[PDB]
Amino acid sequence: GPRVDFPRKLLTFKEKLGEGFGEVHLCEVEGMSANQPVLVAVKMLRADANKNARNDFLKEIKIMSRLKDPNIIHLLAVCITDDPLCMITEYMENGDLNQFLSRHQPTVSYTNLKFMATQIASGMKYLSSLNFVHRDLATRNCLVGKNYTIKIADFGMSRNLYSGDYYRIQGRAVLPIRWMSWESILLGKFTTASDVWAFGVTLWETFTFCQEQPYSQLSDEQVIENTGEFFRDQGRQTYLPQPAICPDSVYELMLSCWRRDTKNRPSFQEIHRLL
Ligand SMILES: Cc1ccc(CNC(=O)Nc2cccc(F)c2)cc1NC(=O)c1cnc2ccccn12
């Protein structure tokens, strides 16, 4: 797994990339590579730190220290000897996919648009195989590297830019209802098939360039109202429309993700093989 206790003084601050638990910094790993040294993302937990919050961070490492895929974020090192506890990952110079695509209609061709979703299906193909369930697959949870390289991460609700993407249902628990299957927002049934339904919405997002929020005309209460219509299956449900620059075949793939029955949905192996 990750390098246990990397020397902290080997990390040179460049800039903080978020403050959601402590804050995330861009750092230069100083000393002995080729031309440019390795730049990393360092997530350091707050000083105050309550036992449960301290435990939450170590639970994040427990989950993150099992992932090893070219399309999954990578946990390089962990500074765990003395406080603050840190978790070190690689750096995706082009930020998140939602922010990246929003700036394009710059231009990314169909081949390269298809290439980003294939890597997402590839990275998702991995998670399934470890019996892991992402629960929140969206372009905001996708990081962009060099030459359209996509890595899947999990940021939670914390990124305040994406607050109107999560619906508070009980206490501090929030839901990405526009990406979730009916059995996910009715029965709380989380499966690879639920992640597949998120993949169809993540592909829709991609093919729309993150310019339109999923279910634009519907509200946070109209979206949960729509889940029941997917279940009732009486032709009173609304699906995402076919994007303008999306082949008939890609929207057909999109549809199979949103099919009512869990078993009737494609696997990530099927999805990756089509893509
Ligand atoms: C440093 C760091 C630590 C913990 C995370 C959060 N992630 C996850 O937990 N993932 C994950 C978990 C389970 C399944 C899965 F599939 C994934 C992330 C980061 N790193 C960044 O935040 C970062 C990296 N490059 C950039 C560029 C711009 C902005 C931020 N970063």
Side-chain angles (χ1 to χ4, degrees):
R3 210 189 295 180
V4 51
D5 301 303
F6 172 89
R8 298 161 184 268
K9 301 264 184 63
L10 254 63
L11 302 154
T12 285
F13 183 91
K14 289 183 70 66
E15 62 146 321
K16 58 127 279 186
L17 323 160
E19 49 197 314
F21 190 91
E23 55 166 2
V24 181
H25 294 185
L26 171 61
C27 292
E28 231 143 44
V29 179
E30 65 152 38
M32 51 197 87
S33 182
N35 194 267
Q36 181 208 295
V38 65
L39 316 156
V40 289
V42 197
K43 187 142 174 174
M44 335 106 55
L45 174 73
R46 278 275 288 264
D48 27 281
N50 36 307
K51 199 209 268 282
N52 51 325
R54 191 115 68 185
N55 270 257
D56 280 340
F57 190 91
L58 294 143
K59 222 104 108 186
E60 208 173 322
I61 297 158
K62 289 178 233 277
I63 303 143
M64 282 193 79
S65 52
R66 257 141 252 263
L67 347 146
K68 220 256 245 178
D69 200 273
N71 307 114
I72 295 284
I73 206 67
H74 206 245
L75 187 56
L76 300 170
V78 275
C79 292
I80 22 159
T81 272
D82 55 89
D83 295 9
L85 310 168
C86 312
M87 53 192 166
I88 307 166
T89 85
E90 72 278 54
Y91 173 76
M92 270 66 242
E93 56 152 19
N94 290 308
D96 77 67
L97 191 48
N98 178 278
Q99 295 166 349
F100 174 67
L101 290 165
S102 289
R103 300 187 127 187
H104 305 62
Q105 61 134 238
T107 30
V108 17
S109 66
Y110 174 78
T111 38
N112 279 319
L113 252 194
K114 204 207 159 172
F115 182 83
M116 296 179 299
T118 63
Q119 288 172 94
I120 298 166
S122 214
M124 280 320 285
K125 190 164 102 279
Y126 181 68
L127 285 170
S128 323
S129 83
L130 331 160
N131 300 334
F132 271 31
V133 169
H134 196 291
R135 295 162 75 102
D136 191 22
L137 176 63
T139 68
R140 65 186 169 269
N141 268 324
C142 288
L143 288 154
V144 203
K146 273 191 180 198
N147 314 304
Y148 310 97
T149 310
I150 316 297
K151 278 189 195 254
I152 315 166
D154 176 48
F155 291 95
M157 209 286 200
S158 280
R159 258 72 170 128
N160 323 66
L161 186 66
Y162 309 105
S163 46
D165 273 353
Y166 304 98
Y167 180 77
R168 191 244 103 179
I169 188 84
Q170 226 292 314
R172 288 174 187 261
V174 233
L175 288 181
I177 51 160
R178 292 161 199 277
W179 290 266
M180 291 167 86
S181 43
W182 58 271
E183 88 279 343
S184 212
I185 341 162
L186 209 144
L187 311 176
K189 179 187 140 192
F190 290 93
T191 59
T192 307
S194 80
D195 272 9
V196 148
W197 178 301
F199 184 86
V201 187
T202 315
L203 186 70
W204 181 87
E205 262 196 276
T206 297
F207 274 86
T208 71
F209 296 100
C210 314
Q211 261 112 68
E212 190 217 310
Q213 209 215 7
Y215 313 100
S216 216
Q217 71 290 325
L218 305 155
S219 72
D220 279 9
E221 272 72 16
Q222 280 175 271
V223 166
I224 66 93
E225 220 154 68
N226 196 29
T227 74
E229 286 316 307
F230 281 124
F231 161 77
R232 291 167 204 186
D233 196 346
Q234 286 212 234
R236 284 259 285 104
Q237 67 231 69
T238 154
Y239 289 88
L240 285 165
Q242 181 184 295
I245 50 97
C246 173
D248 291 23
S249 48
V250 179
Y251 187 63
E252 288 314 311
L253 171 65
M254 245 148 68
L255 294 182
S256 42
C257 285
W258 311 321
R259 258 278 325 114
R260 193 195 167 270
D261 282 64
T262 286
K263 295 157 190 177
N264 279 312
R265 290 165 197 165
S267 60
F268 282 117
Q269 341 292 138
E270 280 155 46
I271 294 168
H272 185 258
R273 197 200 34 76
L274 299 186
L275 287 169

